[PDB]
Amino acid sequence: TLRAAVFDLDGVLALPAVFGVLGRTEEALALPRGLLNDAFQKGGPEGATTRLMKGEITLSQWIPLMEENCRKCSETAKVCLPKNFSIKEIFDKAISARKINRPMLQAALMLRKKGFTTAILTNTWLDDRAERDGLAQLMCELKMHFDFLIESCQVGMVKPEPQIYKFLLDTLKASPSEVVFLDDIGANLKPARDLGMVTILVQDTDTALKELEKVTGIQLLNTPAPLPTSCNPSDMSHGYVTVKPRVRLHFVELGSGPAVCLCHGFPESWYSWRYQIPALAQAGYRVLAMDMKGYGESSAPPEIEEYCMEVLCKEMVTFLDKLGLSQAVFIGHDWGGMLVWYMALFYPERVRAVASLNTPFIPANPNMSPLESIKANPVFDYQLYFQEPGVAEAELEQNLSRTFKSLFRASDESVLSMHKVCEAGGLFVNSPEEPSLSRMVTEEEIQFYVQQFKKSGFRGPLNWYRNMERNWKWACKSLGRKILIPALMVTAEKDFVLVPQMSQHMEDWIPHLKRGHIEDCGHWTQMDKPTEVNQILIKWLDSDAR
Amino acid sequence: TLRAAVFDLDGVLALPAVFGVLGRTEEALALPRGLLNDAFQKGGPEGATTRLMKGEITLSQWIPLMEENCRKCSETAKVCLPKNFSIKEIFDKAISARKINRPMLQAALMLRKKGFTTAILTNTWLDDRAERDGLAQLMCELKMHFDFLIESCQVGMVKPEPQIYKFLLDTLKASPSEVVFLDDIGANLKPARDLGMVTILVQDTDTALKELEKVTGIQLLNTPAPLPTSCNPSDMSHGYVTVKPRVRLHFVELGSGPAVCLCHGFPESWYSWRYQIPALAQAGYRVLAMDMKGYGESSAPPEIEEYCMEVLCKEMVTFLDKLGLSQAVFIGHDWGGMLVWYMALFYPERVRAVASLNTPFIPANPNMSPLESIKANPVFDYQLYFQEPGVAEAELEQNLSRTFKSLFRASDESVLSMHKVCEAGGLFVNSPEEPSLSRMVTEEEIQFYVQQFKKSGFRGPLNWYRNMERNWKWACKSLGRKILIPALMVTAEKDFVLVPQMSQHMEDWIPHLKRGHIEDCGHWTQMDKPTEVNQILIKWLDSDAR
Ligand SMILES: OCCCc1ccc(OCc2ccccc2)cc1
Ligand SMILES: OCCCc1ccc(OCc2ccccc2)cc1
Ligand SMILES: [Mg+2]
Ligand SMILES: [Mg+2]
User: Fold this and answer.
1) CA gyration radius for chain A?
2) Which domains does chain A have, with CATH numbers?
3) Which of B54, B132, B256 to mutate to test the interface with A (most CBs of A within 10 A)?
4) Where does Mg(2+) bind (chains A, B)?
5) What is the DSSP string of B449-462?
6) A238: closest chain B residue by CA
7) 3-state SS class at B295
8) Helix or strand or coil: residue B490?
């Protein structure tokens, strides 16, 4: 029956309600009870407030009108207002006090996920204050989670006038009886009820959600902790930079603030960062999530040397140049992890801060050919398998779905060990034709990967592994240096290739290195423990890169 | 004969030289003459400084080594160093003191323009100081102007070792005798001379440029003031955002800092901002230069209503949403100018600041149908010509080169008056088949436009003019408001359509409005007076939007 849910902003999706600062100010200031609410509401349908809510006047124009009203109200109540009583001040303070009521957003989210059309319907104002950015940020963070945002000041109508509920119904393409509407103001619910909408008078959130749960029959309270927001690829800004004639790099870009460049591993995608992109933007960073050379919509030349670390690094520097970025924070995972340590070592002036998930920094061994170093560790045997051009391409390209479904697995689901891969004749020789879907990924998400790898396949990606010697010789130039810019190493308890202990000597080369550690997290860190990853990166960003 | 010019950074392209802070510090501090330079140079080929310059160690590792050296040098000179004498401090201060020597850059620029291969060859260091961003910014600003940047610490060689001059020659693909090499250090010139390169020992800039002028036979001194840096389209980062299903917007993006969204007029392009894009990035802004809906690589749906101001505005808001920008500064010209005033009036929370070149803000007249208002001004007659779908498309699409060559003209070159265009039967009825090239534009630049307009032609662009009534009705909703966010109006003395006096009542609607005015500047402001435009926008940005 119910197909749509409509939430108000003030006092429903955001708390404390600014209407409510009127009440608290009176108390705080020992003013006559209601005085401020009377001034706010003076003249009713024809007063300052309604013109403001209709978008006739802006907030800054309304401020001195509400001032006049407070003066008139106190005159008729035979009282005085404080010295330096300031509506601008009261409203500035109230508006930045109000935060998203997280459990109400999550209930809206959940309803949207079960197929509800969701909408914000709100009486609000054209805000032109010096401090208006605060509210613009709130609205941005909320509006992305709903099908419609309807603002009194944009449609020229206000709750409780009946026409706005008709506008609402009409926007929803729903009949009244398919809609639940929640509001903290009874008068505003009334015309919804008159049409036969289900209504919830929201006092405390939990009670309102209990009613919402009863009436929709969906669990909203006590639900398990939900994944962070993910990215829909076709809602991203897609960026392209030519860094030299045959080579152009694609990235996805979200947010403003210090630039943070995300570098994925093998065989992945900008999309591997889908859980960190909104969270880091939301946290005040300009996120650039690359397709690394070899992948997705970035170029993928065939030649092996196109993928030695040196070339890859110079290219990332050039990418900063063409974007006009003197620095970025570099954050890498797997191969991307190795690359950012090298960016720190060879281009510190371009790296605001460096962090790696799983990939430790290991210096080159000048006394040992790198193939041999690789042979000394049974778990890098997969890297030897990747040497012979063609062999790994053929296995990985043969059935793309099966490739990513076999690779992308949590630590308790795994079907392939990186163990004696050459001997066995391949990575998938002992895994199923049709692996089950990991808890970490939807079918839709696997198919995104599949589609990305249809463009260039695995030649470029694999070439990353085919410059051991070249990288060795380049890295040897860096053996007297240390990494002295801000640096974070995040180890993954259950990555059985990039084990935590592999990172244990890193303080020798990076004496002020900071750490995080994620338990019960396999190799695919970002999608395995998105929540912990986000928290560890934002904490480290805010304190070391900001 | 000479085909290449090579400049050093310290003391040639940038001043004061940091080598020179050693000398001044000794003086300032009454230390033994040369003490600091001895410590700097201690151990020669095997000392700390040479390892630093070779990229063996980073700056932060070198700092305490040079400290030890100063201590040893003063011990053997039987003197003491000051309390709180700090190499970190001395170097921090020296490195931020050094600026681009503008006349040397401009001489390099000019030589590049006459076909020289230009290069920076420098002894420099891997800089990992907290304050390294300062130098990264300098290098970025310089390196874009040269074919090659060769850094001692990247190639593992230093002046004066002979191998680096061979590396140089080899990078230039030149023989020694085709190269002029300028340096402030004689010992560094010597091996260039040994190979038979022309060398200039740079003490003061002007003398060095006189020698450079004699020897190359090109005028470098006393040259007229040059245009600002322009953009090469295929070196830009190109951005794409889908704002709704059939509509995607393209922009070019350069720089970091507050977001500044540039909105071109009819019939133009992101490329119309080519002179402001580097200057505003350089000035500390994140520039987004749009193709507006209808143009270039943005979508161009056919329907007229796709281009009413309301839709265009909502779309620019959506563009901010998908980029995760809560605000931007909006700067517009012509139609883009009109659009940004409307962004200010209907989305102030999304507009950090608003500025328009040429286009004044005029409120809707609620007592007069807009066609009639347009008819009251002989110079808007061209707007009536644009009403009838097809008519203006056919004339403007007929010969693209001729279209832009006839439109893009300075105030003293013009071939078309906007005067009785309907009556005459068209915009170009009395202009040549092959107009001469305006001083404002190269043939190459015209052809960029031509190529952009081959994608969609003039239907979408023209539709901007075909919603007079619709815009009127929408604008009437805004008649009680004022623009109270920061705002700049720039008038163009010789724009005979958007005349300066058309803007004279704007203070009534925008009481804190700021102004700039450009003399002897026609309708195509950005390319007509790029230098004055840049200066007026940066001054206004830095004080009102920052
Ligand atoms: O799956 C790629 C993980 C990132 C990664 C990439 C390369 C690597 O080098 C092994 C090595 C060890 C010693 C010498 C040379 C190479 C270690 C991790
Ligand atoms: O060439 C386009 C210049 C920008 C511009 C665009 C429209 C405009 O409206 C004239 C008008 C005047 C009065 C009512 C309606 C329209 C004025 C300038
Ligand atoms: Mg409310
Ligand atoms: Mg020098």
Assistant:
1) 28
2) 1-16+97-217 (3.40.50.1000), 17-96 (1.10.150.240), 236-546 (3.40.50.1820)
3) B256
4) 8, 10, 184
5) HHHHHHHHTTHHHH
6) B240
7) coil
8) strand
SS3 (DSSP) at B115: coil
Strand extents, DSSP E, A392-497: 487-492
**Strand A117-122 relative to strand A514-518, pairing:** unpaired
Under the phi-then-psi rule, with left for phi > 0, alpha for psi from -120 to 50, and beta for the rest, what region is A265? beta
Contact B439, B520 (CB under 8 A): no
The length of chain B in residues reads: 546
- Compute CA distances A429 → A417, A437, B381, whole Å: 11, 18, 76
- Kindly list the catalytic residues of B: 334, 465, 523
By the 8 A CB rule, do B467 and A43 touch? no
Task: Write the CB contacts of A217 (distance below 8 Å, at least 6 apart in sequence).
Answer: none
Amino acid letter at A210?
Answer: K
Distances (CA, A) of B523 to A125, A239, A273, B529: 37, 32, 46, 10
> Which residues of A participate in catalysis according to the annotation?
334, 465, 523
Cα B121 from Cα A184, distance rounded (Å): 69
- Distance (Å, whole) CA A309 – CA A475: 9
Angle between helices A400-407 and A391-398 (to 10 degrees): 100
Query: Distance (Å, rounded) from C-alpha B284 to C-alpha A299?
Result: 30
Mutate to test the pocket of ligand 1, among A292, A307, A359 (most ligand atoms within 8 A of CB): A359
Report angle CA B292, B298, B299 to the nearest 5 degrees.
110
HEC states along A246-267? CEEEEEEEECCCCEEEEECCCC
Does ligand 2 come within 6 angstroms of the Cβ of B468? yes
DSSP letters along A193-207, please?
A: HHTT-EEEE-SSHHH
CB A175 within 8 A of CB A1: no
Judge: B321–A143 Cβ closer than 8 Å, yes or no. yes
Q: Is A167 exposed, middle or buried (0-12, 13-18, 19+ CB in 10 A)?
A: middle
Place of tokens 């620029």: B109
Residue the block writes with tokens 């004061």: B16
Cα–Cα distance for residue pair B9/B122, rounded to 1 Å: 6
CA distance A500 to A379: 14
Residues A240, A241, A245, A246, CA torsion sign = negative
CA A386/CA A381 separation, integer angstroms = 9
Euclidean distance between CA atoms B24 and B49, whole angstroms: 19
Distance (Å) of CA A538 to CA A165, B300, B378: 41, 40, 60
A392, B116, B149 from B140: Cα distances, Å? 40, 21, 11
Do A120 and A168 contact (CB within 8 A), yes or no?
no
Mind spelling out the 3-state secondary structure of A273-320? HCCHHHHHHHCCCEEEEECCCCCCCCCCCCCHHHHCHHHHHHHHHHHH
Phi, psi of B10 (to 5 degrees): -65, 115
Say which of B56, B58, B136 has its CB closest to residue A350.
B136
Resolution, angstroms, 1 dp: 2.4
Burial of B508 (0-12, 13-18, 19+ CB in 10 A): exposed
The amino acid present at A40, given as its one-letter code, is F
Which positions in chain B touch A482 (Cβ < 8 Å)? 58, 61
Strand, coil or helix: what is B380?
A: helix
What is the three-state SS of B207-276? HHHHHHHHHHCCCCCCCCCCCCCCCCHHHCEEEEEEEECCEEEEEEEECCCCEEEEECCCCCCHHHHCCH
Give the gap in angstroms from C-alpha B492 to the nearest C-alpha of chain A.
Answer: 28
